[PDB]
RNA sequence: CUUCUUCACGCGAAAGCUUGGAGGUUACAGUCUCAGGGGGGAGUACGUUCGCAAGAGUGAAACUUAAAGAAAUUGACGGA
RNA sequence: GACUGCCAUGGCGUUGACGGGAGCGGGGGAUUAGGGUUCGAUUCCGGAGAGGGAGCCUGAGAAAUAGCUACCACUUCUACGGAGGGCAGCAGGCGCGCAAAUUGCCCAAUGUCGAAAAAAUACGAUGAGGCAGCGAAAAGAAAUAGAGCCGACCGUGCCCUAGUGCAUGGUUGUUUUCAAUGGGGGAUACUCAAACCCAUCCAAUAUCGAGUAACAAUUGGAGGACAAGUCUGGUGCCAGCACCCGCGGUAAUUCCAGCUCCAAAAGCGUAUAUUAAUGCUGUUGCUGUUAAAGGGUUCGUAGUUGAACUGUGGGCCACGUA
């Protein structure tokens, strides 16, 4: 922010990159460079979650609602 | 003179609250006036609508004439007679528009002279008649 | 919010905590676990790595070793986290504040829990109750509540009660004097207000609370093997810490 | 539901146009040849605000404890700062402070008073284009207070020009070298 | 009320008036410079003093000099 | 019952103020009680209750307004 | 009595019941030296509620509102058999009205729930929440810069009459100027869930960036209260001004414009209400002879108020000691 120029931060340091495979999570893995999380899209399949509780078997992948 | 006491509490309450219905601003406030007769509920602004431009010159010796308007207070449906600081701006009022009010501190008297009148037009249209005036403002979009 | 204040929780966020569960030791004069695993040994630090206790289970408690983060821990209960293998008891320092307080293994291979009540049970069986999550079945014939009672806790022994009475050393735990210590002076009967409690604390300065919120910890300081919070319950002259601290 | 404690702060200063209130307040305002009488207000408050403790204190039945907690903590920043002191220790200054003791004690003008600066003001706009280590930051806020020890300090920003082993394209404006390299670069 | 009037003249002063000129003049300070400005304007400079606290000098605007 | 000489500070804006005044009180405090609480509207209103009957009892808001009042003072004046 | 069936005859109220009035109610909130006033929608809790209205089933658990069921009122759809809806969530819309921001990010932290990281396949879920966006109600801090030279000025000391002068000081300016120098934006290493709000000022050892109408001052006053015109010009009981006192018929102090000034200030006008001022409702702390007010008169339960008394110490000693 303003308070310029300025430099004081804090650290941190792993023992394996197992310990921080596990630690780290993908965006401050990436901040690294090590993988990524699940695929946002804004609740695009949320959509799903809203059919899903009333609704048995079928469907069969792909299976749908207000999104026409 | 009062006296009365230790254990008389009960008196002291009722009078003075029997004397506070009594007392006027006590009673005003208490009662409720404003959304009653008065027209603005209380309240801060108010929308209506212009009638007519009205005239005024003063009680005595007072004299000349300031001028203000009839209104029509529009979410109540109220008739009212407003004021116009300056000189001109009559031709801000337009005809019908539907106008932007402000009342008066005044106790609900009147401002100046001008006896009963306790509200001023303060935009006619949204414009800010006050503004214009000045003339930190353009015409209204009609 | 209802946040319990004398777990310490603070400013922002928090609306609920993790909130605890049913399961003994009551919401209010509970110190439940989750906070302990963030907030008190601090290298779990997250919801996140809390989270990954969880999903990688591993916290431990004496008794059960425990999976509940929101079961209440409260009075002695002893924690060991095997990874360091770092114990630590629950139990009040002065000001009347609570500690995770460091306990050897082997006294934090023991502890004690206050009766509060004692029944029948279903055949000229008798049971105990303890004012913190014990039922215990056969115990002596004639203990009563508000009497404390020792527990092996690595087995499944009692190792005492004691044949309670006033000029017994307490530890104040609640009312007022939470945090207090003070063998007991004495309790007047005070029906139905409950007994009210005479105490004094390690100065020998005496001063009263309920007499609900005594655990007798002793005889001749402890008779208990368990830790003993510096200062052992006075409550004094701030004035002076205020002092003392700036050097 | 949930909240924050935020707040509001700080009050201004009862009805006007008095000409002595104008004028006193001024007065000090033209020593210090401020930016608000806002500032002053913040005096007002903050002077009232002890001054207010004090008088509730002095009252207190004598031996007993805030007198002293308080005392003591008042006393000693105050002292401590270099406002109060040890002769205004009864508390009986404390009752009587001025408004002066602490603009005297903002630190800016204890500066200029330090010598630093040719006035003030000199010292408001130095400090504030970034001038004068004490802190983290130079004093980036002259508005501040002392404290008696920053008293000592008050030197350079070794990192402004002003104490750089180097300088930099401003206040000198080195940049004006850049314009020859660039504009006069043959 | 007594209240008397009928709109006939409406306008006019203002408009008579002719609408001169807001005559320009320097920028003044503002903020700090205008402060410790004002100080110096308000008091002291160039100058000794009687006794008197103040008055303007709007008045002279019908002056002598 | 005084009158009231005459005295009291006191009290009071004064005018004035006794038995034990309007005294002994913002140095505000014996009890009990009624009343009162800008002015005007109105003491009125189908408001309401006594009352044979007057009308009493009880009792408003709307509306309105910047004063209204008081004592003294001097002055002016008087078909004094 | 929750309710039947039987029985008794009660129960409540003038410290006011019943009815009728007004808002959920607390934490709290607000303002008063003090005493006090007033608020409490809403972020504290507790409660309440939930289309209107009732009703039910189930479940440990609701009358359970992103459950049912029927009714009211409203609504969708229909190839019009029939079918079918309910944002006092959240954002959105409209609507109303004086009146109140986004169909934004994200799912970190927080909580919270769920399953409870084979994470051996990274990997629940989240309009709660959190981030931004919107957002001059509010609280934090602040900008127009420094200095010198000349002009010039006033202000002292003295020469000197004073003065030039000199000296003694303070201060103006188109002068003059080198000299101050952030905004403000950019190497940016460096953030953030993300996105984002600064940047070390190094490296072409960062480029860049101020003396101006700039890279910017407002708002409201100038009879008085309440700071501030002696009047420039206008104006002419007009225009119009005026919180309230009042200006104004022309050589107006308050009107018109101008200029100057002032006040507060990046805030300020306004409204309405509310708080004190108000011991101007008064426990503290009013009043009631003529200024409001003590009845024509008495009794009188209610009401209040109600005296004393058997409470107490004593003795002695010591000495010092006034």
Redesign the pocket.
Known sequence: ???????T?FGLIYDDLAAM???E????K??LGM?????????SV?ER?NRNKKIRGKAKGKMQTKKK | ????????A???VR??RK??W????????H?F??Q???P?????????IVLEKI?V??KQ???????CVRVQ????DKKIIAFV??????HFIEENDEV?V???????????????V?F?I?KVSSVGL?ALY?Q?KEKPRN | ??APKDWM?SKL???????PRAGPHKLRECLSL?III?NRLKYAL???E???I????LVCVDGKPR??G?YPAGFMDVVEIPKTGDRFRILYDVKGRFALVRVSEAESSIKMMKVVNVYTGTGRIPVAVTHDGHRIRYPDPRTSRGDTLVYDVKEKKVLDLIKIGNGKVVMVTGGANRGRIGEIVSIERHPGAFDIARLKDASGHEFATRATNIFVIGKDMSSVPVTLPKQQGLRINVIQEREEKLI | ????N?????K?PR?????ER?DR??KLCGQYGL????????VNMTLSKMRRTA?LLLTLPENHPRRLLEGSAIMRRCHGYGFLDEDKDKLDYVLSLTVPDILERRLQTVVFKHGLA??V??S???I????IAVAKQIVT???FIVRVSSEHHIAFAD?SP?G?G??????????????K??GG?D | ?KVH?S????????????????????????????????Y???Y?????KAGEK???????????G
């Open positions: 922010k303003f308070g310029g120029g300025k430099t931060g495979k596990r630690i999570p993908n965006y401050r990436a901040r993988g990524k999380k699940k695929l946002p899209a804004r609740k949320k979650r | 003179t009062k006296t009365n006491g230790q254990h008389a009960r008196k002291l009078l003075r004397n506070r009594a007392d006027k601003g006590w009673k005003k406030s009662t006036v404003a009653k007769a008065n603005f509920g209380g309240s801060s602004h108010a929308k209506g005239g010159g003063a010796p007072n004299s000349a004439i300031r001028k207070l529009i979410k109540n600081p300056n000189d001109g701006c009559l932007l402000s009342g008066f501190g005044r106790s609900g008297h009147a401002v100046g002279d001008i006896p009963g306790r001023k303060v006050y000045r930190k | 919010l209802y929780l966020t928090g609306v609920f905590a993790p909130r989750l963030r997250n919801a996140l809390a989270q990954m969880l999903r990688q289970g999976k509940d929101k | 539901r949930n909240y924050n935020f707040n509001r702060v700080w201004a009805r006007p146009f008095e000409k104008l307040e001024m930016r608000c009488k806002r500032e002053i207000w913040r008088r040719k006035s003001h000199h408001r706009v130095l504030q284009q970034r001038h806020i002259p508005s990192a002003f750089n180097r300088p930099g394209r401003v206040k000198r404006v080195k940049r004006n070298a850049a314009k390299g660039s670069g | 009320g009037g709109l006939a003249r409406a306008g006019k002063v203002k408009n008579q008036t002719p609408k001169v000129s807001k005559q320009e003049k320097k920028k003044q300070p503002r903020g700090r410079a205008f402060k410790r400005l004002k110096t304007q308000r002291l400079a160039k100058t000794l103040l008055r303007m000098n709007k008045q002279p605007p019908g002056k002598a």
